[PDB]
């Protein structure tokens, strides 16, 4: 099977060219490949991890909606950014969406988001958890523009991703081709499933909790798009291509410069909306990421190398610790608790060899040892505990 797509790690059409990729599934994570559910083989964007289709009406139907079919399993369809209307490359859009979501399923699987951990797969292959819950992947969904969204019911019910066309440019830009947005959406499924356990999807719904929900989503998109040549001084924006907006869609770029991005824990005291709060959390996580990369290096391969279950590099280590922290923390956690959960994840995974790197990053942005949660009067701290460094 061939997929003509922007390869994993290319955030948007401005950052690479499309290539033809053969059988891009992970043999462990996708036992039946991406185009089977174990019982049926498909010649389309349908299989164990997701079912992708157009949805021009914006309605709730999906099973019998349009998707391209190829008997030779050659999913190579025309695309150029200068094409109009978006519907003229709906095939390419559906395939790019399907590819990105399936690669992410596979990567998350490798990092521990398996069947028993509440993942999204139709057939659990007896591995635990609840099936019948692949991700519904709607390309060019007609229910909106200039956005995207993701529904995360409890384990056993499908996740539902709706991707929109953006209209802030001529021609319109199809979100299916911004990997970052697809990853942002899918990460809502990850964080909601892991937090409070697979059975409970109520657990990132409080204001500060849902804020972190947004932060984890931006963070994973950002970590994944890291490339050869990136440095601590490299900044990243969110949804800059799709939105046609300088600086992207968040208040500041993700940056290790406090002058470029001044956000700290107490910034949350003045925020009322989850995306703005998310930016603060993702900024803290960006500092963690770079401290871990400085110490352990960065693996530019699309899948980690694991040594006794531990990623060998700082990039995949950061992702792993973030996931493991989601599984440790309480339902509807605050920043301080989620931080402690990340620190405890490192204790459980490595015996605590990264406590200094993690603590220093959080302290840098005011979530140090003395930080205190409050609805309206959070206390910031730049303290790192005695003798961790």
């Amino acid at each position: 099977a061939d997929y003509q797509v922007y390869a994993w790690g290319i955030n948007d059409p401005t950052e690479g060219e499309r290539t033809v990729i053969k059988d891009p599934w992970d043999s462990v994570a996708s036992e039946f490949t991406w185009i089977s559910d174990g019982s049926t083989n498909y010649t389309t964007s349908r299989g164990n991890n997701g079912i992708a289709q157009s949805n021009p009406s914006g309605g709730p139907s999906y099973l019998n909606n349009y998707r391209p079919s190829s008997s030779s399993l050659s999913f190579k369809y025309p695309y150029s950014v200068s094409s109009s209307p978006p519907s003229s490359y709906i095939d390419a859009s559906i395939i790019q969406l399907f590819y990105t979501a399936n690669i992410y399923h596979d990567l998350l699987y490798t990092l521990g988001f398996t069947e028993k951990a509440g993942n999204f797969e139709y057939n659990t292959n007896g591995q635990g958890g609840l099936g019948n819950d692949y991700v519904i992947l709607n390309a060019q969904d007609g229910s909106g523009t200039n956005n995207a969204n993701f529904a995360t019911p409890p384990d056993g019910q499908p996740g539902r991703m709706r991707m929109y066309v953006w209209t802030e440019s001529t021609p319109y830009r199809d979100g299916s081709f911004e990997a970052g947005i697809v990853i942002h959406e899918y990460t809502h499924g990850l964080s909601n499933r892991l937090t409070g356990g697979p059975a409970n999807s109520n657990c990132l719904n409080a204001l500060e909790s849902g804020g972190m929900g947004e932060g984890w989503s931006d963070f994973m998109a950002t970590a994944i798009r890291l490339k050869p040549g990136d440095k601590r001084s490299t900044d990243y924006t969110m949804g800059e291509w799709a939105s046609n907006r300088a600086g992207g869609i968040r208040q500041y770029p993700y940056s290790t410069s406090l002058s470029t991005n001044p956000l700290t824990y107490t910034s949350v005291n003045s925020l009322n909306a989850v995306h703005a709060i998310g930016t603060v959390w993702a900024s803290m996580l960006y500092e963690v990421l770079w401290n871990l990369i400085d110490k352990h290096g960065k693996n530019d391969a699309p899948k980690p190398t694991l040594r006794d279950g531990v990623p060998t590099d700082g990039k995949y280590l950061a992702m792993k610790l973030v996931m493991d922290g989601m599984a440790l923390q309480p339902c509807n956690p605050n920043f301080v608790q989620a931080r402690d959960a990340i620190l405890d994840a490192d204790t459980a995974l490595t015996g605590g060899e990264n406590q200094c790197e993690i603590w220093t990053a959080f302290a840098k942005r005011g979530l140090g040892a003395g930080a205190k949660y409050s609805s309206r009067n959070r206390v910031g701290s730049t303290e790192v505990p005695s003798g961790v460094c």
Partner: protein
């Protein structure tokens, strides 16, 4: 529909981290048994159920979730999560269990609470949901109902009777009203007694 940000749940769980877990402790084994014993030690008066989603992570840490109950109902926002280390001891834990006076089962036995259809109407009207509710309710497999005759939802809305810990710390008897309208997929906690007040709204849809 109204601005749902005003109806978000609270974030007042506690997380007892790995360091504090050792500190607060009293001065092979099954991880579920170890976790259950731990909940009983922390919350000796609580009745609860072990949630059927526990697992051992590829880090070797097991995760067990518990849901508090009262009078045979879930306290829907009262949770306990226990992380059990590979050494078989409790590694860390979180909880939002209710530790106050538990109400009498009288109101339940007497069925002295609102009709689930009244709860659905109160939800629709207060939240200004784009749905039509000249509906009827039908029993399911425990104080759990499905609504028929509703228009504007992706599937039939549902109601389940629960307890709910309000923002003032006290227990409400409430209908949990589920309404999937595609743009939003809501669990609304609406009082089943006093005044039909909405205590919280969960949305499964995130941007």
């Amino acid at each position: 529909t109204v601005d749902l940000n005003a109806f978000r749940l609270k974030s007042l769980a506690k997380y007892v981290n790995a360091t504090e877990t050792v500190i607060e402790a009293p001065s092979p084994q099954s991880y579920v048994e170890v976790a259950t014993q731990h909940v009983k030690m922390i919350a000796p008066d609580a009745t609860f159920r072990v949630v059927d989603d526990h697992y051992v992570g590829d880090n070797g840490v097991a995760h067990v979730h518990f849901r508090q109950t009262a009078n045979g109902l879930d306290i829907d926002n009262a949770d306990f999560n226990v992380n059990v280390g590979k050494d078989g001891k409790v590694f860390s834990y979180g909880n939002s269990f209710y530790t106050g006076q538990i109400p009498s089962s009288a109101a339940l036995t007497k069925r002295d609470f609102s009709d689930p259809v009244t709860a659905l109407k109160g939800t629709t009207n207060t939240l200004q949901l784009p749905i039509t509710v000249d509906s009827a309710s039908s029993e399911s497999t425990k104080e759990s109902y499905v609504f028929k005759g509703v228009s504007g939802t992706v599937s039939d809305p549902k109601a389940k009777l629960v307890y709910f810990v309000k923002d003032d710390g006290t227990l409400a008897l409430a209908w949990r009203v589920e309404t999937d309208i595609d743009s939003n997929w809501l669990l609304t906690y609406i009082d089943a007694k006093s005044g039909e007040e909405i205590h919280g709204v969960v949305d499964y849809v995130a941007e």
